[PDB]
Amino acid sequence: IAALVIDNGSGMCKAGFAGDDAPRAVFPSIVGRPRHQGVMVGMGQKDSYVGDEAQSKRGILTLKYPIEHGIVTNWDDMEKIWHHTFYNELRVAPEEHPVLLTEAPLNPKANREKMTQIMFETFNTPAMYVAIQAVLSLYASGRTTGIVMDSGDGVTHTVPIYEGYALPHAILRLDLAGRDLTDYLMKILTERGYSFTTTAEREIVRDIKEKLCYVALDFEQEMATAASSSSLEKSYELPDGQVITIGNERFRCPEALFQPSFLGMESCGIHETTFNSIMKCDVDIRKDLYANTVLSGGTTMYPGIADRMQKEITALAPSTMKIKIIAPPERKYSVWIGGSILASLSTFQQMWISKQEYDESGPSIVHRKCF
Amino acid sequence: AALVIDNGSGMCKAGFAGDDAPRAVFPSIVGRPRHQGVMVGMGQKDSYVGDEAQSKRGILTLKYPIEHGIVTNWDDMEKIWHHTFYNELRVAPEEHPVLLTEAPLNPKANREKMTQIMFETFNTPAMYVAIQAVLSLYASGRTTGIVMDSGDGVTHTVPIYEGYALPHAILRLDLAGRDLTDYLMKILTERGYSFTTTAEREIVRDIKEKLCYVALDFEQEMATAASSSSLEKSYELPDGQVITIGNERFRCPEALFQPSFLGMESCGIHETTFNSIMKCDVDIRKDLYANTVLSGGTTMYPGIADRMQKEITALAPSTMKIKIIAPPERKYSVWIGGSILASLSTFQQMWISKQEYDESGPSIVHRKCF
Amino acid sequence: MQIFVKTLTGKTITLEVEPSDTIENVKAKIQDKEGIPPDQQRLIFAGKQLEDGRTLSDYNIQKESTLHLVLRLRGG
Amino acid sequence: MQIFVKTLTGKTITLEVEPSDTIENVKAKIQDKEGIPPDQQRLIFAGKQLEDGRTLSDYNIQKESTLHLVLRLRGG
Amino acid sequence: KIELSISLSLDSPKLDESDFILLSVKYLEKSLGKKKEFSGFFEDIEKLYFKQNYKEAIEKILDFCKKNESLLSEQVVQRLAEVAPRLKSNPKDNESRRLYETLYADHLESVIKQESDLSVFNELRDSYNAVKPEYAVTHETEIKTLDEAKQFILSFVMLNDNVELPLKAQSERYPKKDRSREELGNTPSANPGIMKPNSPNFTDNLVPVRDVPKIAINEKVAGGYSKTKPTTPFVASLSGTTYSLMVVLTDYIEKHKTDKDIEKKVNQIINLWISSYIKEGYHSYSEVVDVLTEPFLQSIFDKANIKLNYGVLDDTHAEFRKAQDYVFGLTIQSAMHHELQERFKNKE
Amino acid sequence: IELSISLSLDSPKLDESDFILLSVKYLEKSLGKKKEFSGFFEDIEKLYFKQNYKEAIEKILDFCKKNESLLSEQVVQRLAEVAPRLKSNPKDNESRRLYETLYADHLESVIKQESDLSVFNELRDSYNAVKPEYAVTHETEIKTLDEAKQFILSFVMLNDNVELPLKAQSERYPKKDRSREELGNTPSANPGIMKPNSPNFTDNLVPVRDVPKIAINEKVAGGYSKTKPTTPFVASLSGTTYSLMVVLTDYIEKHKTDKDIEKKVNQIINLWISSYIKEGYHSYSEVVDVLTEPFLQSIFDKANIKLNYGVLDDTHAEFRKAQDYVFGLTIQSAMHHELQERFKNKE
């Protein structure tokens, strides 16, 4: 009876059941097939490994990250992610539980339809809904209007939402995200003598990143505090046992977000991009948007993201404006929580795309029901 | 080392060249679960193939991609071939050239798709596709003749001359072992027994292969049985029960000669052999009447050999010379014809290389492998 | 060459440059290594804030010279 | 560069511009001589309504260009 | 699930008159079922809707249901009756209508595609090239594709404010226009037609992003079109460029008074003009129609025997259905957006 | 679908008509409303009506080849195997019988709306002039379509005297297959061409009435039932058509000038057809094939009358109800076969 929810995310699929305030299961959205030598020799119909076992077995497999950049590239390698999800990870039979799915901002008209098709056709979901992750996130804030800065593994979008509608005119995409930061931290930590170059080594530079890294209010004051004092330095126990010390690298990496010149991008930072999108809306609605800037995502989880963003967008904006950056504490899974919420809403029971409707109208029913 | 595969209607007989027996024979059935609860927790196992699918029949829905000779589902035959190459034979297809068998009169489309599926999906370095019956003849030692190929699904009477299976004369019958397992069940049910379930069909195949035989004159044989218990034999069902089977032993394979037993208004295996031989140039008929090789597992019944002659000496001219040649290892004759060919030195040029696949597309099959 | 630059915590950043290099370059190479903006940078050697334009040679900066780095705290 | 702008009554307001002049400037240079608010103004040359953003250079406006002036009675 | 899905929609506070009509007929369509016992009804209601006789349809809707209350559900019927006396349409927010009308333009534009040999437009060229003010450019290329034709009919805007004025002087309706002169600037939108940029639309009907202009309502005008016709979507209040079309059209009519096929033809220009104006965003239907309908203008046609369809079309259902679902969802969402928020005000 | 379709295709009583009705169904649903294929179906519906089953079969199979990427192979295969051995037997062309009977109602209703019944009030006289003295004179007025029918069907009285001078010229009538045996009457609750004992839909059931039984001479060379096996046999061919043509040849000569003689002659000819199929006297092509003979067409040609022969632009309704008949009748063959093979294990 429960409704499965699923964040077809860029780097991590996050899925679960409706009542839950937590994504029950998350796994890398990656799928691999044996690369060479036909190691599928004894593997009965195991020509594909998806999920946590796709990074466990990496040299044995060539990995194609689908849903990278936010939009589903390979539909055949995504059904498998969905199989993994329904059957293997969530231990459910799709045919019995309705499925809310998430789509990125600006999913081409077409991609949405094929998603509707796969669920009803391949999985026989009793019902379905496809939603813009960012609208969902704002929903957990409790807001129907605002701007969400959705930052994740491969795609950062800034979605102004007015009355539940992701305004397509404002949505801006910064193809800078967490992976680029885990890779930046490797770069900066390498120049301090450590050696993090292996794909295996990227995965502990993601722990160092998440566990230690933070966004400094003023990079300049904080770069100084690091040369004028050793307080910022922190120590990480590499799994080899080596204890490494990370200091100025703690804020440098998350700064790549506010100044992406660090990665060779001439693009605007997350602060300017927000403004450049709030300024692509009617003067009338920008007001509420500035007062309702929800930060959702996981690259938004860096300590100090909020305080700095206020500082930065109060400087690109009118001096009378009420700039308020709202970062929920559970933002990593907000997209999903918003969805778990909607699914458990009663009114929503009538907003679902039933199988009967699919039969009658085909795949494009998505367009008319799930705006 | 080349690997040979018989895309049989009922069993996939495969193995390696130079051996004389299929290393691995399994049913050509593929299963996908019926309900989604099974798949819950398994690893991308939307497909159980072979004897695993027979085993797990109830939880699955079986499809016979190669029933009646031609490959209907190419999605599923990929899975049959995977099992064979990787799981059953434990080989990587990328390193072994593959000889495949194609039914008589396989459309030009099917042949092309096979060449593609192999070189594309399995990276085979080389490939050859070849009519099953020419191969069965090859084991017999002949390049000219007619092969009564019988099987689980389709029986073809193919006339071959100098290695070319003549398209004009090949005939096809849809009487085969599966039908004979089913006639036997019915006939044994009438005697009092009860063989209706699929498990029950399973065992009526062993009271078929083991006990059954073809009688030379049915009428005398029906009499022997109604006058003597010489014919009767006993089978121990595995439910701990013994059954007695008598007239049913020859009535069952008679369905071939008299398919009316099964409703078919079709010509029997004797007349079909005549018809193909009569849809051929007179000059070559003589040689075909004396090189009538039998290939198949339904032709493995005891006695088919002598009866066939009785009936085609009566359907054919008086002075004719007629030989029905049944090698003792004929269930796997197609394959052994292949193992013979593949292992040949001269055949090392008839292979279709990957180099040539790319140059000409899936249609190089036609140019090299007729 | 291998000039050394000392932050106030005492740690040294070892930079390698040629005397054909403007301090502007030297300040920047520091940025590449440590992230420090070059406008935060004030490099002091032999008592004087080294002017960016003039090369290392103008101050007789030489091998293993140990330059010093005060990072202009501003904005805060 | 003296362009002549012609009203409907046929009269010409001879204006002196430089090519870099955005049309928005030219409209308000007309608010100088005759007082016509720029908004009321719709300026036309080569069967095109000149647009505020683009410069007169962009429409190949040269020494004598009789740009024409329609003004807008949008009052009611 | 219609019985409740509808009542949930009725709950929406911002229900326009256009919506009840659209939603009701849906309940009635679905629940009653397609029995041709009542097909006369839906056809008038979908025709009166186009012609903006909302109150009439409302009456008919309520009484259709009064008679068929046995068949239907009182719960919906009673509600339909409580919300009805208070229904009102705000021009600036007649969103459902803007969808009906943007889409109708396409149907209408598709009609003309088949109907026209594009003869009239190749003959209206001469009338334009004559009444053109000198500042304008003659059209001398052949109008063969129908996209060429729109460009032409939309270049009648060039005749504005010169030739338009004598014909405009006689309007008793134009003096009540409410475009305010605030030149609030252009805004982007990816929504088609007369649709508002920040308003929801089906993901299939999304034109590429452009810069639509923004216009405002004086609201101090008395008898303004907007206050007389609150049932009209407001993109600029009224077309005076119609008067410029009529300068051209008056001429075509005179110059081709004799021709037998004049009626049909004038209604390919009058009607394309309507399509394109609602399509390219310039004005709504009633903002063009309600200037051409004025008595003084009709005399031109009447005295030359031209009865004008005004684009009324045989079938508007496609757009009725699509609009029914718009309101359906735009309205069940509103309800979600209120339960969502009674669950976040019910926390802490 | 794909199960229901195949189960059905297995009936050994499948006829060309059934394949066309059933095939299109799978095709309609599976392919769905892409409308890229809209014209296919609609032509096939017309080809079906015109008893051109062969071509339709070709197109049906060939459509599939081109659009096989979108279709289940087992089906397209079974269809491909079953179709070359498809035959129609006139004694039991059951599907067409339902289609034709319902097509009579469609035509009756069409003629109804398009007719002021004037023609029948003008044809009224030609009859009264060409009538054999034996016959009564219709001097009343025709204000109901049902009175038009009573009238037209009574040209049966002109038979055997007036009819013969025209029958002698026909080369098709000599090959009539109505056996001369007077087998007699059996009752039926089935309308029109439909056979008495055969199944029907519980809505299309007429009141019980006696119906006639007629038989085929199978010893007639060039038998109609052989030349057009696709046509269900109710009485083989109509000669009362020659009596119609006696009246009509007159009305045409008596109104050669009238402009709308095409329309008018085709409300007569098209209700003749409706009434015959509807009332049970003969099938569609049994009448049409008579009126289409070169000699009879001459009267029309000379008068510039182009006959539609009842072809109607929308036969969808009928096809649908015909598609459903075949579905169930064929699926019930299968249940019954399984039942048989369950009771076959019993006894």
Ligand SMILES: Nc1ncnc2c1ncn2[C@@H]1O[C@H](COP(=O)(O)OP(=O)(O)OP(=O)(O)O)[C@@H](O)[C@H]1O
């Ligand atoms: N402090 C942090 N804590 C946890 N994760 C972090 C942190 N900083 C960055 N991340 C990054 O967040 C990324 C995961 O983002 P998320 O869970 O939102 O998935 P996603 O791919 O962004 O999906 P979606 O776009 O649908 O939200 C990881 O790459 C991780 O490195």
Ligand SMILES: Nc1ncnc2c1ncn2[C@@H]1O[C@H](COP(=O)(O)OP(=O)(O)OP(=O)(O)O)[C@@H](O)[C@H]1O
């Ligand atoms: N005496 C017998 N011994 C073995 N098999 C028998 C015997 N009699 C009948 N059979 C049937 O033979 C079937 C297998 O035959 P076979 O493998 O030749 O079929 P096939 O795969 O179509 O072969 P081919 O590809 O050579 O035509 C078995 O399923 C069995 O039902």
